[PDB]
Ligand binder design. Structure first.
Ligand SMILES: O=C(O)c1[nH]c(=O)[nH]c(=O)c1F
Ligand SMILES: O=C(O)c1[nH]c(=O)[nH]c(=O)c1F
Ligand code: NA
Ligand code: NA
Ligand SMILES: [Zn+2]
Ligand SMILES: [Zn+2]
Ligand SMILES: [Zn+2]
Ligand SMILES: [Zn+2]
Lengths: 362, 362
């Protein structure tokens, strides 16, 4: 007996197109999404060129419309030069992404004053997400308060960070957060097996105490999101390993295993992969869209999942219980038992749907 | 310029049919809903007969399918006799309602042990809501913890109650709550004008400090819901006034006024009248459904709104800014500038839609 779930949403993926298409492209990354039970993705802007201006967004929209197999929204990225320039295209984006720790020079902000300028100029009704680790979480929360608006914290990975967010929520501050599967299911204990190249990720893998703290503080976690960050094995094991793990194809199987073990409920999962993503990012429903899963099937994660061009996975060898059997997207069978059945281009930009515009005062 | 909102959801209405149709019926109460920008309602079970068994639910489903103009779900009610008997129909209901303070004999529970029995027998994946005032909030929260599940607290009306819920959420307990418009926009200061009959409501009107505390603790409020509780003026001013206010037609205009004054944002409103109702009650989206409002039009609430058979309102004389101009429900114009344009029977039971079933483990 299969369980029917709504179409799940991953608010944090890197699809690499334009500019890094040997790692992933819209077609392969959205195939990976569908195979993971995900029918809508929000794509981060740290491509090449990065999505930091209107021409780059226009290019990315057309590449996604031509290549995506599931529905999507595209983030814009904050730079040291673009505050106050994104007003005409802001509402067409998923939101604005601030890279506040390590990143590429084009997305680097050199001063908290630049963070303030983005919070002051980006339209107040539209989402802002931050890559903000350790004390940077507190710092960006301060900027949000000074500018009297909300912020969403990407991939919370540490006891320190979840407890700080917990204290902020206790004070009624408008902050939400997401956690990635590797910060719930991997830890420092896995670095010996992974090795130092494969194991590179930002935020880095936490201690056993970090992992336990995230589980203990599930109530503080608004969303799960993969931070699907594909790189090839050659890149991960070469002389300058880039940080990141692929994760679209493994996220739901890992979390269904946890549900089966009573670590969280099916509802807890659907709040974090469906309802809260919808409400934080003002993402529209998808008509005639659902995912059928088998919660009984036990399997072991192999050395690579079928679709991501990363062609490796840090979860290799983990035993899971839970499988995606079928996905229907807007009335068409999109995935069945390992076969993707919608072509590149089937997916659409949800911000162009009337119901996908973010409501605002005139 | 009009602002487009999604279809709003009111999780707490009394539509009086069967058995009290001079106060309201499905046709009139859902007309009132549409005129208030509400496209989906959850109807409480304290009708005559009350919805406490499968035959009564079957009758109510047919009356609603024949009379409702907007979409709906129907609550079941807990009684001293029905714990352990609702398993076959539970998933067809909005949820289970516990009347833990004053109510009619058929819904009265005489012991906390009966509350425990309902929490133990009602399916663990389905919603439970409670009418629970003052210390009863703490008591039902204890029962929820003993049975290791969630609870939703109806119409929170007091500083005491919102602070207790705030402390429970700080401890990570699974509790949500709603607040009704009269507990945000009326207080003891209005009892002289209303008089003792019209002013009767449960929970009673609070002090100015109660009202201020609810506003100050907006972050703790998950939903707004009207507690539309219609009675005729003759009944409200007679020898044994029943408690309750009509509120479907005034809720959104009152809250839009507050948005216009900067007391909460448009997003804060849409979280509480759309996204959080959806996610707490597992209510499905409504395709091709939206509400257009005018935020500029100033008007004064009259002595009765056009549709509710209550034919009176406690908000008479309040100045508001914000008007519902048009409602589209599933592709048909349902309301325009005071005219309802869908007939009784247009509305449907959302729990019969495939996407309206609550997901559960096999
Ligand atoms: O794009 C990536 O690979 C990437 N990888 C990471 O591990 N963290 C990031 O913040 C990131 F942007
Ligand atoms: O049904 C009603 O009129 C009603 N009225 C109220 O004021 N409170 C209730 O709890 C209620 F059930
Ligand atoms: Na397309
Ligand atoms: Na009908
Ligand atoms: Zn990041
Ligand atoms: Zn990322
Ligand atoms: Zn009540
Ligand atoms: Zn009520």
């Amino acid at each position: 007996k299969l369980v029917r779930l709504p179409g799940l949403i991953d608010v944090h993926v890197h699809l690499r197109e334009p500019g890094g298409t040997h790692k992933e492209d819209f077609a392969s990354g959205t195939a990976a999404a569908l195979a993971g039970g995900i029918t809508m993705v929000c794509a981060m802007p740290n491509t090449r060129p990065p999505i930091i201006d209107a021409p780059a967004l226009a290019l990315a929209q057309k590449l996604a419309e031509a290549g995506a197999r599931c529905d999507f929204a595209l983030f814009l990225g904050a730079s040291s030069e673009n505050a106050g320039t994104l007003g005409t295209v802001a509402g067409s984006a998923a939101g604005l992404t601030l890279y506040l720790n390590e990143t590429f020079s084009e997305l680097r902000l050199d001063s908290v004053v630049q963070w303030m300028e983005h919070f002051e100029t980006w339209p107040s009704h539209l989402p802002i997400v931050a890559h903000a680790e350790q004390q940077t979480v507190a710092a960006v929360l301060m900027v949000a308060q000074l500018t009297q608006r909300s912020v969403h914290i990407c991939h919370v990975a540490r006891k320190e960070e979840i407890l700080l967010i917990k204290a902020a929520k206790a004070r009624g501050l408008p902050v939400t957060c997401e956690v990635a599967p590797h910060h719930l299911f991997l830890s420092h204990d896995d670095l010996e097996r992974l090795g130092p190249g494969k194991g590179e990720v930002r935020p880095e893998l936490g201690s056993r105490q970090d992992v336990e703290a995230l589980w203990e503080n599930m109530a503080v976690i608004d969303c799960f999101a993969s931070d699907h960050a594909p790189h090839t094995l050659e890149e991960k094991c070469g002389s300058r390993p880039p940080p990141g793990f692929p994760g679209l194809e493994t996220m739901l199987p890992l979390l269904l295993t946890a549900v089966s073990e009573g670590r969280l409920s099916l509802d807890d999962l659907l709040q974090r992969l469906h309802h809260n993503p919808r409400r934080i990012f003002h993402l529209p429903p998808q008509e005639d869209t659902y995912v059928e899963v088998d919660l009984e099937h036990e399997w072991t994660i192999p050395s690579h999942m079928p679709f991501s061009k990363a062609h490796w996975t840090p979860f290799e060898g983990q035993k899971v219980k839970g499988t995606v059997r079928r996905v229907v997207l807007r009335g068409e069978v999109a995935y069945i038992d390992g076969q993707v059945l919608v072509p590149p281009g089937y997916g659409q930009d949800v911000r162009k749907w009337p119901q996908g515009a973010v409501p605002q005062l005139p």
